[PDB]
Design a binder for this molecule. Structure first.
Ligand SMILES: O=C(Cc1cccc(Cl)c1)Nc1cnccc1-c1ccccc1
Ligand SMILES: O=C(Cc1cccc(Cl)c1)Nc1cnccc1-c1ccccc1
Lengths: 304, 304
C-alpha cells in the first residue's frame, strides 16, 4: 500500500542526454540513433529571441557551429535540419545506448515523467501531466531546455515532450519530438497567454479510487448522481466534463473496489461543494488530478 | 521556476537490481561488486514469519538455495552470510554496472529517492523522507522488498535504505545497507507501533523559502518571533523543535531571499495558528516537510 507521484525509472533516457552548444547558447539534446534532437532556439542570441526568423538564422549556421557533447566525447555533426520548433543534428555515430523508442504526441490530461537536465547532465526526475491548457507545471531553470518527457512500456520509451519555454506566469510550454508545440505557444520572447486551466475530472476520480484502495474512505457517502448532474457541479468548479469514455476507462477501478463510477462522482460532488473540512486524502488537502486511471492501476499492480 | 517532489535520476541504481529467490519467496536484491544484498526474510515461509529464528533458518540453507538473477542471467552464489537483517550473497561475478557507492545511515528528516522494484525489475522512482518516527510513507506492494533508497553526489550513489516491511498502519519500515532497521522495528509478523510522527520544521521552512523564490509570497507577514516563542507554537502542532543548527542550515536560503529565518518562522507560526484559508503554497494546501534546505538549494540551482 501507499500512493506517491511516481516517475518511470530514467536510466533509458539518461543514456540519451547530450549537450548542444550553438554560439553562446548551451542546452540539452536527445541523441537517438545518429540524430540529436534539440529546441531550435539554440541558434538564437538574446537579441533575436524577441522576433526570430529561424529560417534566416539557420542560414548563417553550418554543421561545425553545432557543438554536440555526450558526457565528455564530442560528436561529429554531418547534417542539420529544422523540423517545426526542433533542430535535428545528424551525427556520424549512432547512440550505443539508444533504447527502443517511439515519438508520440500525448493528449491533454495524460501523464509523463520528465528528466530535468542541465548541460546534457540529468539532475532529477519527476512526474507531471499535460494540463488541459497544454502547459505543464514542472521544475525547470535556465539551461533545462531540451529536457524530455516520456513514458515507458516494458522496454520501449515513448518520448512525448521536449521542454522549450517558461511563460511569464511561471508555467512551462514545449513541443512533441517532431517540434510541434503543445498549445498555441510559439518560441518567441513575447507575452503569451496560457489560457484557463481546468481540472482533469477522470484523473481526480481515479485518485479517489486509489485512495479507497489504500484505505482512505472518509469521503465515501450514501449518495449517487448522474453524468448530467455531476457535470453541472463540474462546470461550476472548472472541472472537465465527464464523458461515458471516462466512465469506461474507470471500469477496472470500479470493479476492483466495488464502487460504481457514478457513486464515486457523488463523493467528488460533495467534496467540491463542501471541501475537505481540514481532512486529507492520500496525504493531500486538495483534489489531485495528475494520476490517470492507467497510473492508478499500474501503481496498485506493480507493472515493471 | 517551478517546484516539484523530484527524485534523483535512477539509472545508476537500476543497473544494480537483481531478483533473489529462496524457496518460494521472491524479492529484490542489490548487486554491488560481487555481493548481492537483500532482506534476510527471503529465507522465510509465511508460517515462520510470526516468530523466526533467522540463524536457525539460515542453517537449513546452502549457497545453491539462493537463486540470484540479473535480467535473464543467473548469478552463481559462492558465499552467504547474515549481517543484522540483510543477507549478503557472494557471487562469482562483479556487477559490471556497479557505480561509485557508499552505505550511509541517514538521519530522520533527511530525504532520499526510492526505486520501487518487483522481481529485480524497476517500476518507478519517487522522493521521500525518513520520518522523525523512522518510518517512510512510500508506495510498496508485495514483491517490493529489497527496493533501495539512495542519494547521488555527482557520480557517487549513497545507498541509505532497503525496504523490508509494511506496518498494519500502511506505513513502511526498513534498514540501512548494513541491515540495521531504522526505528524500533523488527522483521517479524507482529503488531509493531510506528510511534508519533512529528513534522520536520526545518524542511517546512526550507519549502516556505522555495515558495518565496518561486513567487508564492501571500503567507509573508509584518511579524517576527524568537526560537523559544516559535517552539511554543511548534510543540502545540507536533512540529520538531527548531534549533540554532536548523537556523544555520537555512542561512543560504535566508541570504538568497533576504528574509531572516525568524521572520519566516513568524509566517509559519501564523500559518499553523490560522491555516491556509483555502489558499495554496506551491500547489499544496498543507505545509510540505519532505524538502530539506539542501533539496531546495539543489532544485533552485540545478545541481547535476
Ligand atoms: O523561457 C526560457 C527561454 C525562452 C524564452 C522565450 C522563448 C523560448 Cl522558446 C525560450 N527558458 C526557460 C525554461 N524553463 C524554465 C525557465 C526558463 C528561463 C530561462 C531564463 C530566464 C528565465 C526563465
Ligand atoms: O509486510 C511485508 C512482508 C513482511 C511482513 C512482516 C515482516 C517483514 Cl520483514 C516483511 N511486505 C510488504 C512490503 N511493502 C509493502 C507491502 C508489503 C506486504 C506484503 C504482503 C501483504 C501485505 C503487505
Amino acid at each position: 500500500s501507499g500512493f506517491r507521484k511516481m516517475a518511470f525509472p530514467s536510466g533509458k533516457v539518461e543514456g540519451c542526454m547530450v549537450q548542444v552548444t550553438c554560439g553562446t547558447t548551451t542546452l540539452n539534446g536527445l541523441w537517438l540513433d545518429d540524430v540529436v534532437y534539440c529546441p531550435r532556439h539554440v541558434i538564437c542570441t538574446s537579441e533575436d529571441m524577441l522576433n526570430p526568423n529561424y529560417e534566416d538564422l539557420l542560414i548563417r549556421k553550418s554543421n561545425h557551429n553545432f557543438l554536440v557533447q555526450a558526457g565528455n566525447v564530442q560528436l561529429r555533426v554531418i547534417g542539420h535540419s529544422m523540423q517545426n520548433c526542433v533542430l535535428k543534428l545528424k551525427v556520424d555515430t549512432a547512440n550505443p545506448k539508444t533504447p527502443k523508442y517511439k515519438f508520440v504526441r500525448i493528449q491533454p490530461g495524460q501523464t509523463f515523467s520528465v528528466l530535468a537536465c542541465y548541460n546534457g547532465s540529468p539532475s532529477g526526475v519527476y512526474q507531471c501531466a499535460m494540463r488541459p491548457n497544454f502547459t505543464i507545471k514542472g521544475s525547470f531553470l535556465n539551461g533545462s531546455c531540451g529536457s524530455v518527457g516520456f513514458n515507458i512500456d516494458y522496454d520501449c520509451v515513448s518520448f512525448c515532450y521536449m521542454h522549450h519555454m517558461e511563460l511569464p506566469t511561471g508555467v512551462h510550454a514545449g513541443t512533441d519530438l517532431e517540434g510541434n508545440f503543445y498549445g498555441p505557444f510559439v518560441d518567441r520572447q513575447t507575452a503569451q497567454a496560457a489560457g484557463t486551466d481546468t481540472t482533469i475530472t477522470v484523473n481526480v476520480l481515479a485518485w479517489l479510487y486509489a485512495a479507497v484502495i489504500n484505505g482512505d474512505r472518509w469521503f465515501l457517502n450514501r449518495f449517487t448522481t448522474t453524468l448530467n448532474d455531476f457535470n453541472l457541479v463540474a462546470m461550476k468548479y472548472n472541472y472537465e466534463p465527464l464523458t461515458q469514455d471516462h466512465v469506461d476507462i474507470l471500469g477496472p477501478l470500479s470493479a476492483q473496489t466495488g464502487i460504481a463510477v457514478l457513486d464515486m462522482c457523488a463523493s467528488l460532488k460533495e467534496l467540491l461543494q463542501n471541501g475537505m473540512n481540514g481532512r486529507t486524502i492520500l496525504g493531500s488537502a486538495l483534489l489531485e488530478d495528475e494520476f490517470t486511471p492507467f497510473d492508478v492501476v499500474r501503481q496498485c499492480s506493480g507493472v515493471t
